[PDB]
Amino acid sequence: ASQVRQNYHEDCEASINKQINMELYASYVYLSMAYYFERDDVALPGFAKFFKESSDEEREHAQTFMKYQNKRGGRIVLQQIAAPSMQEWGTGLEALQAALDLEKQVNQSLLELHSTASGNNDPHLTKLLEDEYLEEQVDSIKKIGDMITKLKRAGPHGLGEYMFDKELN
Amino acid sequence: ASQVRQNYHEDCEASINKQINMELYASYVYLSMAYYFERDDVALPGFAKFFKESSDEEREHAQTFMKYQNKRGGRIVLQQIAAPSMQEWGTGLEALQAALDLEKQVNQSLLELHSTASGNNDPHLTKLLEDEYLEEQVDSIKKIGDMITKLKRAGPHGLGEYMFDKELN
Amino acid sequence: ASQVRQNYHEDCEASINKQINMELYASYVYLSMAYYFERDDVALPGFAKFFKESSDEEREHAQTFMKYQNKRGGRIVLQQIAAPSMQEWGTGLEALQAALDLEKQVNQSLLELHSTASGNNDPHLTKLLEDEYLEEQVDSIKKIGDMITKLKRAGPHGLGEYMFDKELN
Amino acid sequence: ASQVRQNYHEDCEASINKQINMELYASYVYLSMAYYFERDDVALPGFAKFFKESSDEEREHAQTFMKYQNKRGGRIVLQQIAAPSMQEWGTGLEALQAALDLEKQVNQSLLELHSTASGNNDPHLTKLLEDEYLEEQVDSIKKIGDMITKLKRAGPHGLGEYMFDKELN
16 A cells, blocks of 8 residues: 555545545536526626636536645546536526535535545544535535525516626626 | 839729728717617617717727828729618617618638638738737627617516616616 | 627537537646645656646636636536546656646647638637647646756656756756 | 533544554654754755654644643543664665655554544544644645655756755755
């Protein structure tokens, strides 16, 4: 094994690999949304900016796991990144609903990985998940719910969609 | 011929003369729109400003061609500038539709002039069109399409027209 | 079609989609290298940094094509991103050889896309490739060749690899 | 008991005392290395500096546990600090190997203390270990592994040892 490896279970190692693939997928999905919202026939720059930033954040999370994997003397194994489920994402509202559902799947996987880490008595890995992932993922879900409420109030279509988009830009 | 002239075909020279007239026409059309939108019974200052600026830019394009004509040792020949097709331009939306159609006509003439330049193997003139006109004309068309979508979402009449006019001011 | 589309051939549109996938693939390959070189048992931070930066640049290229696609009124279609060919990249030298070969493949695809654009008389698209991609791709290939010579001189293994890695950090 | 004591198990108290002795020992070992590397017949100032700093850090960890012990209303019990195992530490490489092994023993003891704290449902103490000790100890092990790889590449003797030492200074 690596000269650095210590108290680092195979299953935690493999579950981090899967999490990397997952965060990269999410990044890609958000990249798709961001450019969807810059189509000349959609033109919602606030939503575009929101999803670009979310695409960048999700990529950083993947990288943070890639760095973590080497930090513990795990080996990074990179797999195919699947095409996003959609090429077009409908209204602002629909894209936010899909983002909420996506964030909640990511949170569920992160919590599964926390449980795996707890099961194997790996407090360094439970701390990483707590400090770097779980808090942010709750904040991000809270934010998207709030956005969805605000958009429903304002719009969700027509002038209200336009006004809500401005407050995101 | 001019002491400077070199690899500059008569047809390219005459096609630039026509393009100068055309950009001056577009300038004049946009000037008409700009003052249309400052009528007391229209009062859309964002559209006014947008079209004034577009009028100035189209004038600068004509001048850039006038300077180019002299740079190659062509002779500038200035013709009548026609009255704009309309004196009143209807709603903001209608003005933008007419602008879009106008920009696409200018782009088409520019691409024809590119093909003429390529046909006569004048790479100095194909470069000018590429660097100074074609990129800007694509951006400008993209911009107007985006605007038209946003105005359709927000308005296109009533409060939404008022609000969209504000993002433009 | 899009309200903005003009002189934009389907084949150019689809070839840009493929190029987007390709630049994202190259990004992913370089990401893999970058983290390969931060393994505790490789520890070549200069190569790590070099490949991280290259990963970021290749991602920016994909995004520039995604924005271009929308600018012309094309529709972006995102496909699976394949796993990198390798999980481990051997020595610094070997990684650079694989990078060189990769860059030359991207350059070839870019030149094919230029020929497609020229064939369809799309001078806006030939200009983009010339101004944004082709110059940078030549520079990048020149840079890697130079690197490969320098590493061969210095090293390519042992102390020389260590020293060369330092000029890169 | 102390007026402040609350949910603080005897065994956690005694295990912190032992950890203090342990971190003080490590400090002393690193102090020995640091001065070994300043011998006129060794003269590796980078290694000297590295180990002095590590000696200081290990002393700070001991103090942080001494402060923690009083914070919870435990009583500090200080024992003999044993002589370092060696008076001379051989090559740079050998000293790093011994440091790696030492850091890994410290990490193992810290994880044992985490398990003891978890067993006694002391979340204040599991949090201290997670935030103040376990992260740093993983970083430090990762760092020493990287160093060992880099030194093996560069040297590990002769000019390479000299050059690697410079990058530590």
